[PDB]
Each structure stands twice: as C-alpha cells, then as structure tokens.
PDB file of C-alpha atoms in Angstrom:
ATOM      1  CA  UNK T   7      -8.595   9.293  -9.384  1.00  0.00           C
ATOM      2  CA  UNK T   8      -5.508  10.707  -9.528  1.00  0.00           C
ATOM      3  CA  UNK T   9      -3.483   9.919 -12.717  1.00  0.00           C
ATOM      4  CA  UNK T  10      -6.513   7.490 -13.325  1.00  0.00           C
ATOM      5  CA  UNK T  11      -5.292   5.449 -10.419  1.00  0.00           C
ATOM      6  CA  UNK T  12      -7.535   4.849  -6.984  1.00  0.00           C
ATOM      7  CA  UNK T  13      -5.677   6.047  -3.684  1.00  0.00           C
ATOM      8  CA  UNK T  14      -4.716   2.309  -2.492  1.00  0.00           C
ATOM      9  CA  UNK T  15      -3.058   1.912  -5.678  1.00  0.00           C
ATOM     10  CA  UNK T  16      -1.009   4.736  -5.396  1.00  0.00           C
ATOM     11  CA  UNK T  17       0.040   4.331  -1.857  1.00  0.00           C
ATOM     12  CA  UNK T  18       0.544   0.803  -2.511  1.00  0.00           C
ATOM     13  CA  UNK T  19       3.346   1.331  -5.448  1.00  0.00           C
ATOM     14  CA  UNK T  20       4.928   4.274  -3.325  1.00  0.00           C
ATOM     15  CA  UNK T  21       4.927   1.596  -0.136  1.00  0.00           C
ATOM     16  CA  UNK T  22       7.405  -0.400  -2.058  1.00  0.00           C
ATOM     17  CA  UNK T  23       9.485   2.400  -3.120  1.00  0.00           C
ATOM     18  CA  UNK T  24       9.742   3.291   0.772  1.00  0.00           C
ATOM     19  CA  UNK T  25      11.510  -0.401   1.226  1.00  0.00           C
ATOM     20  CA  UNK T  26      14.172   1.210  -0.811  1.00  0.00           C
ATOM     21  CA  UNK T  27      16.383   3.599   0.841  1.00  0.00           C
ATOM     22  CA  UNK T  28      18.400   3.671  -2.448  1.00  0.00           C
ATOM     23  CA  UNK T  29      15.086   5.253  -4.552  1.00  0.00           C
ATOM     24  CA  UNK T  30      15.669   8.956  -4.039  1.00  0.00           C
ATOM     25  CA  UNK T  31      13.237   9.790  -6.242  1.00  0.00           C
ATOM     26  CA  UNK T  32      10.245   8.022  -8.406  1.00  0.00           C
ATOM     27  CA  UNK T  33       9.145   9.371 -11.827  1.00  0.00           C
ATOM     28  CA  UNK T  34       5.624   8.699 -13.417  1.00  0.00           C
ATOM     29  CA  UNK T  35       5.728   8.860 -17.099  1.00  0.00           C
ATOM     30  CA  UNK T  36       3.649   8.297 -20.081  1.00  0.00           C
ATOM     31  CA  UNK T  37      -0.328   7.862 -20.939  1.00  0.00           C
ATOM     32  CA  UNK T  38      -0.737   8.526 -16.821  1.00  0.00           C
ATOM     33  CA  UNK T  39       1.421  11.337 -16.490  1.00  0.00           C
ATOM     34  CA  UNK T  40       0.158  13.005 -19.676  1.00  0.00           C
ATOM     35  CA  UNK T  41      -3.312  12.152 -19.146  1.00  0.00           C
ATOM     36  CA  UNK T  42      -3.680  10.974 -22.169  1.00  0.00           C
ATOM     37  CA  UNK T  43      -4.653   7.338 -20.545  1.00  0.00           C
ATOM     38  CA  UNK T  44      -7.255   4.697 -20.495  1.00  0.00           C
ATOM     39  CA  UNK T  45      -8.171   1.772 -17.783  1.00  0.00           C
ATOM     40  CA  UNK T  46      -5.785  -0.103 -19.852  1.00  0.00           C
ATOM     41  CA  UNK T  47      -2.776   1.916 -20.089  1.00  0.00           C
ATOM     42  CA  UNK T  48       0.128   0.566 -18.094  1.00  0.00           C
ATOM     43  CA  UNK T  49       1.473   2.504 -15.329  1.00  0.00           C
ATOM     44  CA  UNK T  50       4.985   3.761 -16.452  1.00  0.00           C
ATOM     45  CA  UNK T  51       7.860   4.511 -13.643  1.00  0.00           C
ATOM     46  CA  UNK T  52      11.487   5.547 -13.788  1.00  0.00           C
ATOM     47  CA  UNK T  53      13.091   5.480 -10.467  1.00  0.00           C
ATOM     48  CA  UNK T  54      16.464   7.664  -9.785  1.00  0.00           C
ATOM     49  CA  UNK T  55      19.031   6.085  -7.652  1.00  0.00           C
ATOM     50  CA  UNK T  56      22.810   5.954  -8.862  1.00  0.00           C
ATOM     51  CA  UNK T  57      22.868   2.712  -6.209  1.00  0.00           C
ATOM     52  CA  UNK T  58      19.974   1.108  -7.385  1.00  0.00           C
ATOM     53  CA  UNK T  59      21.250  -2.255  -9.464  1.00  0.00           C
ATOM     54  CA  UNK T  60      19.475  -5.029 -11.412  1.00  0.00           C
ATOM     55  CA  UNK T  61      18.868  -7.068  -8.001  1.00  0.00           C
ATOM     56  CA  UNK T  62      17.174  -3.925  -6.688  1.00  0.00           C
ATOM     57  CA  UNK T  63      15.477  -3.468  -9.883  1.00  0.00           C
ATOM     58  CA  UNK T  64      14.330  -7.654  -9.835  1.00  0.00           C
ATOM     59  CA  UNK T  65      13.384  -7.366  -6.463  1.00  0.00           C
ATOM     60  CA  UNK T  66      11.026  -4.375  -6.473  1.00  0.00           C
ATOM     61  CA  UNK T  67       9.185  -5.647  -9.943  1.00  0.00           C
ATOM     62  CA  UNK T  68       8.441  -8.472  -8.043  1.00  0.00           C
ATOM     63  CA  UNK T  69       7.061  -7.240  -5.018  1.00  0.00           C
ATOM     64  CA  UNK T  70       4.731  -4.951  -7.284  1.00  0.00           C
ATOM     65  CA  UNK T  71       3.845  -8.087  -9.519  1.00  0.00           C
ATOM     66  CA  UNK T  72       2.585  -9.547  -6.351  1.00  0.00           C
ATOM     67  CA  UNK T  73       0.078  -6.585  -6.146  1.00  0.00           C
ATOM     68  CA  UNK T  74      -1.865  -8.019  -8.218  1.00  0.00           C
ATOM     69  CA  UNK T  75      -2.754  -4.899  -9.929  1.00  0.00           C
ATOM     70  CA  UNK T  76      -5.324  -4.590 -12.967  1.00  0.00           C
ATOM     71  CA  UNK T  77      -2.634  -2.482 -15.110  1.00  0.00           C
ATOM     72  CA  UNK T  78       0.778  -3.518 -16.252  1.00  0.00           C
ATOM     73  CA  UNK T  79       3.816  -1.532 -14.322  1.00  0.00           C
ATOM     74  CA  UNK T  80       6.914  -0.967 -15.974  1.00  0.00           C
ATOM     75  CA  UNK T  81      10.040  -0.137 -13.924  1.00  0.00           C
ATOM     76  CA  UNK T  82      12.614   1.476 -15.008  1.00  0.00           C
ATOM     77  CA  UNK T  83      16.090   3.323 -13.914  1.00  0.00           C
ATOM     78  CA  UNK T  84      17.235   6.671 -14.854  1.00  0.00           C
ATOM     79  CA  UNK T  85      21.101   6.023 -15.255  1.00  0.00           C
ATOM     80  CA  UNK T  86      20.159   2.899 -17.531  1.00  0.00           C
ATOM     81  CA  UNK T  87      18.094   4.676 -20.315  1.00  0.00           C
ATOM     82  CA  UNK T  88      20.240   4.523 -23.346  1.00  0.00           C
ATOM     83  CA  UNK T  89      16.942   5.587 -25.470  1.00  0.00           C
ATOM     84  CA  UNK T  90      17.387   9.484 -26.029  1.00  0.00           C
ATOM     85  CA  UNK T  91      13.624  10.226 -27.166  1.00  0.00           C
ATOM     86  CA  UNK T  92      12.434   8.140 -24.115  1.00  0.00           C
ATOM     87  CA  UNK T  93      14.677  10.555 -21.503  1.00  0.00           C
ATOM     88  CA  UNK T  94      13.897  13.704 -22.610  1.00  0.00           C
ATOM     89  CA  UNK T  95       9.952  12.612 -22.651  1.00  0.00           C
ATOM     90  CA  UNK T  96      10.854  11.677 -18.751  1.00  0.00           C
ATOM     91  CA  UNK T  97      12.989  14.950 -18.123  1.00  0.00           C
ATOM     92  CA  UNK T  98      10.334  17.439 -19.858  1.00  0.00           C
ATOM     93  CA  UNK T  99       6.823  15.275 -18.858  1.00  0.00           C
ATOM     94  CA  UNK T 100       7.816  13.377 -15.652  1.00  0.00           C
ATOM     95  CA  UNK T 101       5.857  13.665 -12.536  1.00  0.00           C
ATOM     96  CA  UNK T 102       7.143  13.185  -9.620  1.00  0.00           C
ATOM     97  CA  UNK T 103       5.476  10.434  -8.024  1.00  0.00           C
ATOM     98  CA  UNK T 104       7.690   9.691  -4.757  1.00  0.00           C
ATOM     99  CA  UNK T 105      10.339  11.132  -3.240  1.00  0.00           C
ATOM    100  CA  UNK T 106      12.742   9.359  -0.320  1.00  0.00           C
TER     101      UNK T 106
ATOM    102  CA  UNK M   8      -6.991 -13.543   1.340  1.00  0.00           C
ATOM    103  CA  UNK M   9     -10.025 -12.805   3.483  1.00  0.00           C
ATOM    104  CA  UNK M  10     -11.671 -11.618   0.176  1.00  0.00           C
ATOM    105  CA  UNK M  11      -9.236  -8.964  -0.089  1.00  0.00           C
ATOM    106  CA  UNK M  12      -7.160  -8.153  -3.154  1.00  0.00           C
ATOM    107  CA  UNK M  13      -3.352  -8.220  -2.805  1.00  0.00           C
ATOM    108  CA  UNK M  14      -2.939  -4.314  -2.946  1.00  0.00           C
ATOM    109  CA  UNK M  15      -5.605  -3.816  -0.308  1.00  0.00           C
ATOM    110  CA  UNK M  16      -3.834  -5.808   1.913  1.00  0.00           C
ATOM    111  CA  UNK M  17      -0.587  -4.161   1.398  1.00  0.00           C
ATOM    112  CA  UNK M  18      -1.622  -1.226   1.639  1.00  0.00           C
ATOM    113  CA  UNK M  19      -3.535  -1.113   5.302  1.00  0.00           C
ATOM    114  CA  UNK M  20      -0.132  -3.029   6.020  1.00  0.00           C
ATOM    115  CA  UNK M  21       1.456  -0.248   4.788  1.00  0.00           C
ATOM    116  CA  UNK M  22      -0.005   2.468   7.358  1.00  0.00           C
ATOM    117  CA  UNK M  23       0.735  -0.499   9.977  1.00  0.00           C
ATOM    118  CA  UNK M  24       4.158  -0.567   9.199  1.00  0.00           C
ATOM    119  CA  UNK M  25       4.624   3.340   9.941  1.00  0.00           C
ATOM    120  CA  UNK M  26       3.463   2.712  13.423  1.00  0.00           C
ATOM    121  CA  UNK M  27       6.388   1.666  15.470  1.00  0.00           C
ATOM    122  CA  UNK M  28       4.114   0.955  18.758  1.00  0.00           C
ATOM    123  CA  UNK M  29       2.104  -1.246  16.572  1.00  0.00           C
ATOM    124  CA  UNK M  30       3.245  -4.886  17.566  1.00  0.00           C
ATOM    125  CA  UNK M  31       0.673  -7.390  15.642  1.00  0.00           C
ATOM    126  CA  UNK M  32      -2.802  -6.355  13.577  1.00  0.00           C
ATOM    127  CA  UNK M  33      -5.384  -8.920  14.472  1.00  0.00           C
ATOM    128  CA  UNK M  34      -8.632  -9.565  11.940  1.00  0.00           C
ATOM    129  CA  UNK M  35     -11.392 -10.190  13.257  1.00  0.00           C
ATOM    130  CA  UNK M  36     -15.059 -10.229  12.531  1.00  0.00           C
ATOM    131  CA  UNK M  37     -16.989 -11.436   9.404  1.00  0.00           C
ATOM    132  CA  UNK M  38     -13.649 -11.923   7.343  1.00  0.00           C
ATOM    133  CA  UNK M  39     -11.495 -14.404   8.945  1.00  0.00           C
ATOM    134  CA  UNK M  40     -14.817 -16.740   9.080  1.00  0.00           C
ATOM    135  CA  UNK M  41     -16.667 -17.592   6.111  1.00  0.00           C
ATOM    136  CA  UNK M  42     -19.615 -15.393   6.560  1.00  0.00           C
ATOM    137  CA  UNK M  43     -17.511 -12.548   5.108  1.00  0.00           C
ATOM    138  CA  UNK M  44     -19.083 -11.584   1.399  1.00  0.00           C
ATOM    139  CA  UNK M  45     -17.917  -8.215  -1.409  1.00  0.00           C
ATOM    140  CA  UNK M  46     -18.652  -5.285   0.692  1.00  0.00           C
ATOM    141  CA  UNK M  47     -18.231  -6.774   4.321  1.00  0.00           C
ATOM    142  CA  UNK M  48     -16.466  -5.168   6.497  1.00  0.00           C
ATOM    143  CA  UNK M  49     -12.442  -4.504   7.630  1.00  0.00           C
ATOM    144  CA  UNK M  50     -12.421  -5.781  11.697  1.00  0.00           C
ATOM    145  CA  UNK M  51      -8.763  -4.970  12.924  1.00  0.00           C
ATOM    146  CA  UNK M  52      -7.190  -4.730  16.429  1.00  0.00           C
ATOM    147  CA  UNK M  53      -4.531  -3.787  17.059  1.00  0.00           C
ATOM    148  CA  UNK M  54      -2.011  -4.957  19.564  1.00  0.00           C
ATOM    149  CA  UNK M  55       0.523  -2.578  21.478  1.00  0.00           C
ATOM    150  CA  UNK M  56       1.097  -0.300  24.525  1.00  0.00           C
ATOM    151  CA  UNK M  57       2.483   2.274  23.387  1.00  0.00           C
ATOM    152  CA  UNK M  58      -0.620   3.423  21.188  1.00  0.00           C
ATOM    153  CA  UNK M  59      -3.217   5.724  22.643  1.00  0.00           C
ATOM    154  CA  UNK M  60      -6.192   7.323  21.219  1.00  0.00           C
ATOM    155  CA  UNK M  61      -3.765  10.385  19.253  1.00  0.00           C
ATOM    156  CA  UNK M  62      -2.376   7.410  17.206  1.00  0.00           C
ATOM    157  CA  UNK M  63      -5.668   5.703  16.830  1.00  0.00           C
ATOM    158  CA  UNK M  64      -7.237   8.436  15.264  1.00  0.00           C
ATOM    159  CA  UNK M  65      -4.081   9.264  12.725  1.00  0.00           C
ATOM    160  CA  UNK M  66      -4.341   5.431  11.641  1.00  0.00           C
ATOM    161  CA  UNK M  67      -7.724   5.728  11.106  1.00  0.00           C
ATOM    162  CA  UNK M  68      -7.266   9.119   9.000  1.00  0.00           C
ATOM    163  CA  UNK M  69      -4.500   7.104   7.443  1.00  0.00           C
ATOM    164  CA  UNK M  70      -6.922   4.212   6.011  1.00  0.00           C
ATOM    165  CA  UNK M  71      -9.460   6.895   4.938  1.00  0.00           C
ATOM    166  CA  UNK M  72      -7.048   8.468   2.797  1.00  0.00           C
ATOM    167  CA  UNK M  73      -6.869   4.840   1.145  1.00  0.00           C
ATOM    168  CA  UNK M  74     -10.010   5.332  -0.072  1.00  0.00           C
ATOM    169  CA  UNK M  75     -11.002   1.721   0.282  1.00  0.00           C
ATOM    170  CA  UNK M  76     -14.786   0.466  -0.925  1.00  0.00           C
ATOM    171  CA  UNK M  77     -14.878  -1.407   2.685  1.00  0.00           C
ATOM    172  CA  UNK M  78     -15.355   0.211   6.405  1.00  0.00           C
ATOM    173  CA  UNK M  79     -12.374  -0.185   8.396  1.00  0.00           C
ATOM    174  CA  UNK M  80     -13.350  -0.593  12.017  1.00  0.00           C
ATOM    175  CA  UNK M  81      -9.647  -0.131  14.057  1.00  0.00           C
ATOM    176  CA  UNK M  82      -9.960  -0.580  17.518  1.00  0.00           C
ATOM    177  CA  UNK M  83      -6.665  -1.279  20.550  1.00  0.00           C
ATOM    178  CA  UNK M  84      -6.672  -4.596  22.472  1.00  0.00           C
ATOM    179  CA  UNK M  85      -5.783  -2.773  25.489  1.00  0.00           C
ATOM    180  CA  UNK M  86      -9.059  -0.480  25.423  1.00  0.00           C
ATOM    181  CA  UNK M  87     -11.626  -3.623  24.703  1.00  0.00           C
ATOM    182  CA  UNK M  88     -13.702  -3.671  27.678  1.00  0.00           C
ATOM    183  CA  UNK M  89     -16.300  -5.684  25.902  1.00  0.00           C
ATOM    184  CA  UNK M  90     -15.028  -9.021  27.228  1.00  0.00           C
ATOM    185  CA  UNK M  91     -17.466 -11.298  24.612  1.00  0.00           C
ATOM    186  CA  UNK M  92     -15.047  -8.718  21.781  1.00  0.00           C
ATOM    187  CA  UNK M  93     -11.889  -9.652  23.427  1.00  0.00           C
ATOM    188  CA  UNK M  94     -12.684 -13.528  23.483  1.00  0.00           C
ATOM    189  CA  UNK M  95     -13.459 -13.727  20.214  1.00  0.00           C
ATOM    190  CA  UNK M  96     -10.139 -12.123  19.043  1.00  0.00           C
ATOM    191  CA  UNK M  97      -8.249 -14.402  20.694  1.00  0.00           C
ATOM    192  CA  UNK M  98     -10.593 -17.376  19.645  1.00  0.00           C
ATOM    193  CA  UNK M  99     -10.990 -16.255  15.880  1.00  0.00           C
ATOM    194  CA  UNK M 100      -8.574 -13.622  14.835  1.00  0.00           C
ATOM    195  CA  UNK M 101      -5.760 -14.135  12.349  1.00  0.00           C
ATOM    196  CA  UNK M 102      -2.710 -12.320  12.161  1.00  0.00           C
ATOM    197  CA  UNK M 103      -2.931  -9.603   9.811  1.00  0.00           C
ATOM    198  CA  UNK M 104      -0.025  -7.573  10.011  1.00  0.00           C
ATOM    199  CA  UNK M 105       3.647  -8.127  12.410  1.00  0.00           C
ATOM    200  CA  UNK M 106       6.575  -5.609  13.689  1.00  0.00           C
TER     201      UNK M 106
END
C-alpha cells in the first residue's frame, strides 16, 4: 500500500488530475507523505499550476468527493499558500504524486 | 452501482478512457442482474474495431495494476463466437463506460 493507499485509490485521484491539462504537477504532503499516517489520516495534495483558478480548484474537489473515498482529501494550490511553515513542509517533504 | 464503490468504477473507467479504439464498455454477467453478491465477479466487453488482442492484453495488465479484490474478465464483442455470450450482452448488459 503505497503511502497507505490501495492502487485504485491512487490511480483514481491521479485520473482526475489527468482531466486537467492546467495541473503540471501534483504534490502529496503530510501524515502520507511522511509516513507518519494512520487509516484515518486525510490524504493531503497541493497541485502546481499558475492557470489553475478557484473554478478549477471547485471542480476537481468535487469530482474527488464523488469518489466516495474512506479518507478526507484536501486540495490545495501552490501559488495560493500564504502559510510559510505549511510551504516549506511541501517544498522540503513533498512527493511527487503526478506529473502532466 | 452494480455493488461497486464509486472509485472502483472510476477507476476501470479510467484505463477505458486511455483507449481511443474503445467505443462503449458493456457489463455483463452476475452484476447487472441481481444475483451479483461482495466478491462476484467484473464481466466487461468491450465494443470497438480498432482493438485487437495487443490492446486486450495491455487493458487487462492495466486493471491488474488496480489491484482490485474482484476478477475482471475483459473480453471484445467482435471476437465472441459464443453466440448464447453475445445474446446475452445485448439482452442484459448495461453501459459501463462511453467515448
């Protein structure tokens, strides 16, 4: 189980990400990427895409709340962090999870 | 749907989706009918003209890398020489996946 997560899963959340030309790049971060995670944890991605916008950002949220997935996904984009300690945990522990 | 979860679904309609000679997935069998129960099997055809057995055989890798609990059983409508099979797809099968 990579990152804790089964292989559907996995291919599942990066399916979505393909829909999106604008994702160049998608960022696991947190319990998952640190390994530090239980079946609880929530799955924690930060995608990079300067033309990715908040209707991009609605639309794929709800596409992966329609998943229907046991564990909580939080979305997030690069060029909107304003949190300092949460970038640099993303810059120094990120895995890259999907790439264009 | 068809005692699938959401994700499972998606995702084998994920590896359909990178298959531009794929035209329509078709499920068949025990799902699609009430007899399906939890560990039943995945029945799918698949509907094109363009596929051959080189594509066949990727898919299939495809779904294995999935990893699902369930067999997946992929077969092409153009290759179904069992006639009783072929009847029943049209007579039963729902429309998994479409171009």
């Amino acid at each position: 189980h990579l990152y804790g997560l089964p292989s559907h899963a996995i291919e599942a959340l990066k399916c979505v990400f393909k829909e999106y030309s604008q994702i160049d790049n998608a960022i696991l971060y947190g319990s998952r990427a640190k390994g530090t995670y239980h079946q609880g944890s929530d799955i924690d991605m930060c995608l990079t895409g300067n033309l990715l916008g908040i209707t991009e950002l609605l639309a794929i949220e709800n596409k992966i709340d329609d998943l229907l997935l046991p564990w909580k996904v939080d979305i997030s984009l690069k060029h909107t962090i304003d949190n300092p300690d949460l970038l640099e945990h993303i810059e120094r522990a990120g895995i890259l999870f999907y790439t264009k």
